[PDB]
Amino acid sequence: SMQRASRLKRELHMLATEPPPGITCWQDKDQMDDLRAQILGGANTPYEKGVFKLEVIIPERYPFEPPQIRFLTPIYHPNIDSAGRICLDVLKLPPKGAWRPSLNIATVLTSIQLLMSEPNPDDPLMADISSEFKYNKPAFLKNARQWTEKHAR
Ligand SMILES: COc1cccc(-n2cnnn2)c1
């Protein structure tokens, strides 16, 4: 689609020139729909000083379907599984999800960054991590720092 191509050119321009703080997103090679991203661990979170790489695949029906995004860097988190799958509303279409075409790549990467600082334990992909987050926060923070040290630094 040329509608899709023109939109991706604009988004890549905006990601290059006005990236959200802590976030970078780029073309892996020469295809505007095969992207990579990076989110820095937030300050005052157990992921601080980690650098987290993500894969960002733009489906054929974008912007009417959401970007398909998974962590490539392992992360210890209630809403992200061991393969990097992310449970987040803006990465899914209605009725269950929140994606709409007025969101964009920068918007959902910012939502993922926020998810990292503020887990949603009521909708987990990792039930044991979620219970630990809810009921033994000091142990969750220590495990999340150690996982960051081992895999993201
Ligand atoms: C609030 O609960 C929700 C809402 C929307 C999507 C999800 N998903 C989690 N993993 N895939 N979708 C969970």
From Swiss-Prot:
Auto-ubiquitinated. In contrast, according to another report, autoubiquitination does not affect E2 enzyme activity. Residues 3-153 form the UBC core domain. One of its GO terms (cellular component) is nucleoplasm. One of its GO terms (biological process) is DNA repair. One of its GO terms (molecular function) is ubiquitin-protein transferase activity. Its EC number is 2.3.2.23. There is a cross-link at K92 (Glycyl lysine isopeptide (Lys-Gly) (interchain with G-Cter in ubiquitin)). It is found in: Nucleus. Induction: Down-regulated following hypoxia. Up-regulated in breast cancers. Pathway: Protein modification; protein ubiquitination. Changing F64A: Decreased binding to FANCL. Keywords: ATP-binding, Disease variant, DNA damage, DNA repair, Fanconi anemia, Isopeptide bond, Nucleotide-binding, Nucleus, Phosphoprotein, Transferase, Ubl conjugation, Ubl conjugation pathway. The active site is at C87. It comes from the Eukaryota. It catalyses: S-ubiquitinyl-[E1 ubiquitin-activating enzyme]-L-cysteine + [E2 ubiquitin-conjugating enzyme]-L-cysteine = [E1 ubiquitin-activating enzyme]-L-cysteine + S-ubiquitinyl-[E2 ubiquitin-conjugating enzyme]-L-cysteine. Belongs to the ubiquitin-conjugating enzyme family. It is linked to Fanconi anemia complementation group T: A disorder affecting all bone marrow elements and resulting in anemia, leukopenia and thrombopenia. It is associated with cardiac, renal and limb malformations, dermal pigmentary changes, and a predisposition to the development of malignancies. At the cellular level it is associated with hypersensitivity to DNA-damaging agents, chromosomal instability (increased chromosome breakage) and defective DNA repair. Accepts ubiquitin from the E1 complex and catalyzes its covalent attachment to other proteins. Catalyzes monoubiquitination. Involved in mitomycin-C (MMC)-induced DNA repair. Acts as a specific E2 ubiquitin-conjugating enzyme for the Fanconi anemia complex by associating with E3 ubiquitin-protein ligase FANCL and catalyzing monoubiquitination of FANCD2, a key step in the DNA damage pathway. Also mediates monoubiquitination of FANCL and FANCI. May contribute to ubiquitination and degradation of BRCA1. Directly interacts with FANCL. Interacts with BRCA1. This is Ubiquitin-conjugating enzyme E2 T. It comes from Homo sapiens. The gene is UBE2T.
